Write a protein that binds this ligand. Structure first.
Ligand SMILES: CNc1ncnc2c1ncn2[C@@H]1O[C@H](/C=C/CNC(=O)c2cc(-c3ccc(F)cc3)cc(O)c2O)[C@@H](O)[C@H]1O
Ligand SMILES: CNc1ncnc2c1ncn2[C@@H]1O[C@H](/C=C/CNC(=O)c2cc(-c3ccc(F)cc3)cc(O)c2O)[C@@H](O)[C@H]1O
Ligand SMILES: [Mg+2]
Ligand SMILES: [Mg+2]
Lengths: 213, 213
């Protein structure tokens, strides 16, 4: 699979226990061999600056995929801080675990195998969670708003909890964006950037007719 | 419509009778306001170099859309040379005509209103055509191969007729590309480039929870 190819490329090219090199290896392979839905380096630098500002002790990530953003966030956590990341595809969750293992970040991250709507109500009881400091939304785009309402209902948000959402323009999360921007329960800020790895290769073919034979 | 917006933008910003400025006006508007399926400047420079090499006396264009490539090709034709361009959408063909009118290139171009499969067999009789020197393919991608076989059947190709096809990688014309590359009746050359106007804008939203009220 495309996702196995990515993991193998990192294992052959990155330096073990170096999270920065793992990120660069993923970025190169997806810019010049196979496009994949990682957050990418340009939005990733915005992610970095937001995490550095708030220094969250407990982060929830929705949709781990190959682990690109788990590595990006875990490397910036302080000693003792934790990240929990939810991934419903068993293939993808195993890849994310090997990615973090290779990065040396495995001790800070806990992968949760299942669907957000099933797991979010089990967070406090099964994972000793009180409230989240930060939530990163990057799963199916029509589930951002439903899961936000679910996190509120389950008491996982506190005043000051930072939600951070990818792809609010492309492919777009229009119901989520209208809700949070119109609600007095959320103060919103927009960080404009560019979709990941989008120098799309195409070409012209010249075909010169030679005659009947 | 998006296509009216493009034409109006050119009328307000380009210099009348200057084909180069008309091309730049289209390019700016589609890079920073609305994406549209013009060939674009990067593949357009390859088009330019191919036309300059072969100096065709008679060019057929399949799919005029807004007239971007009609203007690009007509401005490079020698005195007396002709371009015929087929466009089945009445809205689009009227825009292409106003584009060329504004560029001052109207005298070299003849717009044909209808479907390629209907018009290609009427070319010689109704438009005094013998054989084509060059054909530019940029219409529906599944019609490149059918129309190529139709042009051959109707006797419109001569030895040395240059076919030049856009989008052979993205969105792709896989049956056409396999056919011409495997056929002894065509000598093929690939010019690698990049899809037009593809710095796709996206962003992150930060939404900070404020509490129940
Ligand atoms: C619904 N509850 C859920 N609970 C747990 N995991 C869930 C999940 N939904 C989805 N997942 C997992 O999240 C991941 C899904 C992410 C969906 N992302 C996209 O569609 C996406 C798509 C693009 C994109 C870019 C260009 C384009 F032309 C079309 C799409 C860009 C992105 O950054 C994206 O994030 C998978 O790993 C999936 O198994
Ligand atoms: C079939 N016979 C025909 N005879 C006469 N005119 C015909 C025609 N078919 C189509 N047309 C006209 O050609 C034009 C159609 C062009 C189709 N082009 C594309 O799909 C296209 C699409 C992209 C594209 C780029 C990015 C992307 F994500 C998806 C698509 C890029 C391009 O350069 C393209 O040319 C219209 O003006 C239509 O009315
Ligand atoms: Mg994303
Ligand atoms: Mg095209």
């Amino acid at each position: 699979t495309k996702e196995q190819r990515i993991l193998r490329y990192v294992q052959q090219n990155a330096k073990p226990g170096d999270p920065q090199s793992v990120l660069e290896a993923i970025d190169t392979y997806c810019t010049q061999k196979e496009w994949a839905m990682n957050v990418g380096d340009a939005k990733g630098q915005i992610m970095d600056a937001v995490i550095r500002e708030y220094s969250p002790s407990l982060v929830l990530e929705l949709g781990a995929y190959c682990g690109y953003s788990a590595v990006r966030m875990a490397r910036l956590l302080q000693p003792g801080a934790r990240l929990l990341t939810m991934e419903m595809n068993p293939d993808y969750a195993a890849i994310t675990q090997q990615m973090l293992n290779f990065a040396g970040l495995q001790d800070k991250v806990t992968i949760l195998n299942g669907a957000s709507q099933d797991l979010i109500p089990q967070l406090k009881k099964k994972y000793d969670v009180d409230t989240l400091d930060m939530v990163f939304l990057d799963h199916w785009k029509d589930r951002y708003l439903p899961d936000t309402l679910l996190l509120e209902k389950c008491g996982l948000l506190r005043k000051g909890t930072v939600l951070l959402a990818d792809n609010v323009i492309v492919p777009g999360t229009p119901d989520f964006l209208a809700y949070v921007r119109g609600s007095s329960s959320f103060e919103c800020t927009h960080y404009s950037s560019y979709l990941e790895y989008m120098k799309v290769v195409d070409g012209l073919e010249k075909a010169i007719y030679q005659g009947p034979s």
